[PDB]
Symmetry: C3
Subunit: 318 residues, 3 copies
């Protein structure tokens, strides 16, 4: 009948060496929050949550702001949250680079501030979904559905959704006097994923398919994407990970394109509240845009070459 | 001789349906604060207060930032606070719409960040006042005085003040190239209010009068405003409320104008830390601008028509 | 082997009367933070720190964001911190005006958000240093080294560094259409300081020398600066302080210039968590720009005259 109040956070600190650039030091995506939960009876519980950022860069601001109601019929969560998409994710186990090949948030950056989200667990067969209120085109249209289920040692999921931005930035031409090109884009995407636990080892594979149509315009981009990845706990506190990520983008204009991302890294944990990371990442070719869930990094649509990247992490959790 | 340190807050979450618009979900005006109080002796106590916002929208920022000193001669509070005006308020018992007819903050939005405020309670006959430092026209001129007193079951107040903005936005014409019209406006206002408690019931009536002159210009707007309102606790945790609010604006140019706001709603409280709200609001005609104290909503000067509005609230307090 | 978690802060409130201006009230530089420390063994400790602002003015934001590692070989601190320079400071004991004559941060405002800092204490002979990562000219080049040592009752330090901004604001001409003049400036500075404790009394003297060269341009400004200052605890809770600060700026163009700052004030402390300040400050002539460490005030490059300033402070610490 009573409740729990958890005050939690991370203090990320990163040292990064990215292709063609200088060393950076500073915060990663440090944040701090408060999960408050209260069980009323057996068919009713309540949640109040609010995470905010402690990045070293801009003004500080709220990241998630949530009212949750759990029932017999499932949990409904309301307000500013990450997309159901991002919660489900897919097979990327990096803390820096990588996450390309998951194509759910080309337009969303994994976020919609004005959304309703549903969850339902069972004899671990589960269902998650969400809807984004466009709050009169101040926000994106969003709608997603995923479903999964574990078979003892195998773990599966599939689903997708549809996200649209009426005024999304597609380019720039300045002429002196600097302006960007807006355009109304729809991203309609689907995935399937499997994960296999072999004691220390873990393997994962995801396939993403995705369609970017533009209204008042013939253009269409079919993306088709394969992530394969895994982790292996070696010593007592030590985990290694890696992944290959291959993406192909056909345009309806004929124009074909691809992109490759490879990573290899190590999570050591002095404790659970004290972790350090080291990761290499090789990239070549094109992304249309992606989010690394581990760093919270956004990479906007780009083409890379010859592309080496190292990242050294040190976090304090609470 | 010792002190109290209260860490407090609200986690508002609102679902709103306003005339001619789409559904919104998200935070209302969530905030969080710290009241710190310390009694030194019988003729001396100290306060330190700082509230900040957790809205789901912009950067997060400080709302109130206060140093208070209580004495025999009364409490002096210093720094960023709401106007004495707003503290006193008048008869509006809504959580969303309504608050028109209180005319104290057409220009202030109920706030001055650089003000000194005085309070004095007695054999409950009380006096409140405040002054806003213009800090060289970076801020509004403000000066207010209110006085009240309870007669057992009747509760009265009257007062007003004068607030001026040297560069207040009166309109816009863009021509291609988008610009707004500034103008130096004075709002000089007075009210009287009475409130009557009949066990479960509560009735309230306020009258506001107000004068907007403009310097270097003939224009003047006399507002004259009548709020009447009340609440009635029905069941164990249930309160109902309503109000009629009628405002008339004569201009000195001849031009007459009016505005009507009606509300009806219900506060249910699962507990004191858990409340839910439902409110209807009908509006027709003109406001020159107003603040709803219950939602923290600002409505800028506007004319409405045919105007239906619903609002469903859910807050967690601490 | 365990750790300490300190939640700390200040609630500054200031009332200021500066030459040619109106009274201001409001916050000074209120902030709040969390120092977290953990000793692992005798040759290893860890720190996590994050201070953020509660100013009454803009958005709220992070001030310092730190990962510290202490060893036998010394403490390395990483991320957003004040400059080593500012930590060391020099002889200014004011809470408002004064701090001119310390010339370390003409360009930095005492801050670099992307810096590595080293510290080493001994049989109190100490060494501090730091490097600022230019993170590809998004940030200033910085590099500093200071060293000190106490002789029982005398306390000495000397050092300096070099700080450069590729695009620093040197002026403005608007022509209608408002633009500022950027220019690539280097500030290369050195100091020596001594401090003498005579029970209640304290005396201090600093000398600063500094050179501002500009790339692609003949201009150079030699500053040469003498602060002399002190404090004297009179009654039980009462401290008085004062300082004379004289600065001379030769330009390489011939053009000579100077500036004088004098202060006198009193720190009374009702307790350690409750302090009040009163300070007078006389200024005449030129600063090229400076920071008062006590108020956190930035004064941009300016020439003053006839210049009287009072400041009344009231802080609550925790
Ligand atoms: Ca915790
Ligand atoms: Ca509380
Ligand atoms: Ca403390």
């Amino acid at each position: 009948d009573a409740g729990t109040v958890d005050f939690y956070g991370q203090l990320r600190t990163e040292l990064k060496f990215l292709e063609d650039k200088d060393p950076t030091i500073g915060s990663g995506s440090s944040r701090a929050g408060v999960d408050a939960n209260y069980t009323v009876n057996d068919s009713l519980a309540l949640q109040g949550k609010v995470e905010f950022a402690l990045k070293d860069s801009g003004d500080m601001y709220v990241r998630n702001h949530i009212l949750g109601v759990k029932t017999n019929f499932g949990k409904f969560s309301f307000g500013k949250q990450w997309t159901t998409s991002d919660d489900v994710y897919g097979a990327d186990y990096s803390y820096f680079f990588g996450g390309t090949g998951l194509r759910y948030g080309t337009l969303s950056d994994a976020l919609h501030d004005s959304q309703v989200k549903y969850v339902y667990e069972a004899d671990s067969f589960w269902v998650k979904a969400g809807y984004g209120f466009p709050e009169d085109n101040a926000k994106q249209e969003l709608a997603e559905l995923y479903v999964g289920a574990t078979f003892g040692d195998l773990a599966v999921h599939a689903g997708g959704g549809q996200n649209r931005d009426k005024a999304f930035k597609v380019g720039s031409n300045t002429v002196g006097t600097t302006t960007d090109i807006k355009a109304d884009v729809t991203n309609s995407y689907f995935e399937v994923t499997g994960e296999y636990t072999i004691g220390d080892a873990l393997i994962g594979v995801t396939y993403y398919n995705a369609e970017l149509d533009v209204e008042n315009n013939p253009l269409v981009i079919d993306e088709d994407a394969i992530s394969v990845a895994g982790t292996y706990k070696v010593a007592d506190k030590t985990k290694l990970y890696a992944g290959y990520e291959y993406v192909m983008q056909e345009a309806n204009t004929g124009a074909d394109e691809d992109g490759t991302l490879v990573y290899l890294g190590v999570e050591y944990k002095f404790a659970s509240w004290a972790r350090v990371y080291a990761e290499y990442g090789y990239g070549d070719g094109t992304t249309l845009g992606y989010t690394n869930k581990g760093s919270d990094a956004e990479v906007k649509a780009t083409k890379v070459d010859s592309a080496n990247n190292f990242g050294i992490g040190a976090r304090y959790y609470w």
